[PDB]
Amino acid sequence: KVGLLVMAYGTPYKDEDIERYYTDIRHGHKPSEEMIADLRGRYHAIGGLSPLAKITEAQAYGLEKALNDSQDEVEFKAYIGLKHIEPFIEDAVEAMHKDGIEEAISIVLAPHYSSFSVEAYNKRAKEAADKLGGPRINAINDWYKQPKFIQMWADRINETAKQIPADELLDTVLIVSAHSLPEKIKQHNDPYPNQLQETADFIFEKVVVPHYALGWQSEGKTGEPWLGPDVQDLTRELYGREKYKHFIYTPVGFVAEHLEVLYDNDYECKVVTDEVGAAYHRPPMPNSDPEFLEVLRTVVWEKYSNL
Ligand SMILES: CC1=C(CCC(=O)O)c2cc3nc(cc4[nH]c(cc5[nH]c(cc1n2)c(C)c5CCC(=O)O)c(CCC(=O)O)c4C)C(CCC(=O)O)=C3C
Ligand SMILES: [Cl-]
Ligand SMILES: [Fe+2]
């Protein structure tokens, strides 16, 4: 009945895909052999390829089932629309149209909104809808305010923090982060940095960890300022000022274990904590955990109810 357009970045299915994938990320402008080798190396450092493709499938169809098992007002049919590899956003909308789906709710697998992320997802999805003639795309822009989302993260952080000696929890700090973007989005009151601060604040309101700070990660290869501080620079800064013994990294901008977590956090950030002599913690990402599917099920239903 109702189309469930679940959108995410996408990831190379094969080592042979890294090239066209990176090209699509660079809006067609093919990267150099050096850029490709750096990216391929990062993928190999996390075991070869990312599990994002399978986690994304599990989230998309785990969400479809969660919605369908919880009510019978409508039947949701989930179509996956990736940003930089097939099936693309336009392919998903094409499938919805050919399948007779005339109404759909779209959600990005990223809780926060920004001109670079969700807006691009929604523009492409809605423009594909306009051209094909359907379906009608009712887009969710953000859902970080979903109480179950905040609680999910607080629980994970609390699960980890209660593994920290009480006499060292005062020396523990929570690093909330998301994918960095060009700092210029802050010049036009882009909500992204604020949604992250709000998310960090909400989660801090509900965890035992007494210290927290908002960082950014995965800044791109460009020649303009990107949002900071970077989680690595932040870790250094915080150890210098407070000598924290435990760093709990929650890249709440992401919803799955993928390259931007398995490398930029589990490697690059751990390198810094190893350096300063502090402990590294990175709670499990939501992936397709039942409570996260419940978060998405709640977000999508509240959206449908408001249609
Ligand atoms: C806001 C945002 C999200 C969060 C929202 C969302 O989920 O959409 C996100 C997620 C992801 N980004 C990812 C991967 C990459 N992003 C890149 C590059 C870039 N991302 C950007 C932005 C974002 N990205 C930007 C503005 C660039 C620079 C483009 C340019 O300079 O032209 C590059 C190129 C190399 C590099 O710059 O590091 C890669 C490989 C993966 C998949 C990881 C895997 O494969 O497991 C995921 C989930
Ligand atoms: Cl992008
Ligand atoms: Fe990206």
CA of 179 to the centre of ligand 1 (A): 7
Does 246 contact ligand 1 (Cβ within 6 A)? no
- Expressed in Å, this structure's resolution amounts to 2.2
> How far is Cα of residue 223 from the mean position of the Cα atoms in its chain?
24
The pair of three-digit structure tokens given for residue 296, joined into one six-digit string: 């998405």
* Residue 114 alpha carbon, nearest atom of ligand 1: 1
Assess contact for 85 and 11: CB atoms under 8 A.
yes
Strands (E), 87-184: 103-108, 136-139, 172-179
Cα distance between residue 259 and residue 49, in whole Å: 8
* Strands of the 136-139 sheet, one edge to the other: 76-82, 2-8, 103-108, 136-139
Nearest CA to ligand 1 atom 42: 11
How do 211-217 and 136-139 pair as beta strands? Answer: unpaired
> For residue 245, which of 204, 215, 277 has the smallest C-alpha distance?
277
Nearest CA to ligand 1 atom 31: 220
> For residue 35, which of 16, 18, 49 has the smallest C-alpha distance?
18
For residue 247, list its beta bridge partners: 173, 280
CA of 268 to the centre of ligand 3 (A): 17
- Contacts of 288-294 spanning 24+ positions with Cβ under 8 A: 288/55, 288/58, 288/59, 288/62, 289/152, 291/148, 291/152, 291/155, 292/59, 292/152, 292/255, 293/59, 293/62, 293/63, 293/66, 294/66, 294/148
> For residue 236, which of 158, 173, 190 has the smallest C-alpha distance?
173
- Note the ligand closest to the C-alpha atom of 21: 1
CA of 22 to the centre of ligand 1 (A): 9
Classified as helix, coil or strand, 268 is helix
- Note the ligand closest to the C-alpha atom of 10: 1
Tell me how the structure was determined: X-ray
Does 117 contact ligand 1 (Cβ within 6 A)? yes
Classified as helix, coil or strand, 77 is strand
Cα distance between residue 251 and residue 265, in whole Å: 8
The DSSP symbol for 269 reads I
Cα distance between residue 178 and residue 281, in whole Å: 16
CA of 18 to the centre of ligand 1 (A): 13
First to last CA, the chain: 14
Residues written for the chain = 307
Classified as helix, coil or strand, 108 is strand
- Helix-then-strand count for the chain, H and E: 12, 8
Does 8 contact ligand 1 (Cβ within 6 A)? yes
CA of 102 to the centre of ligand 1 (A): 31
Classified as helix, coil or strand, 205 is coil
For residue 197, list its beta bridge partners: none
Tokens 């996956």 — which residue?
80
> For residue 176, which of 259, 256, 266, 254 has the smallest C-alpha distance?
254
- Note the ligand closest to the C-alpha atom of 218: 1
- Note the ligand closest to the C-alpha atom of 114: 1
From the annotation, which residues make up the binding site for Fe-coproporphyrin III?
9, 11, 26, 42-43, 50, 121
CA of 83 to the centre of ligand 2 (A): 8
Give me the amino acid identity at 31: P
Other Cβ atoms within 10 Å of 222 Cβ, number: 8
* Residue 192 alpha carbon, nearest atom of ligand 1: 1
Nearest CA to ligand 1 atom 20: 220
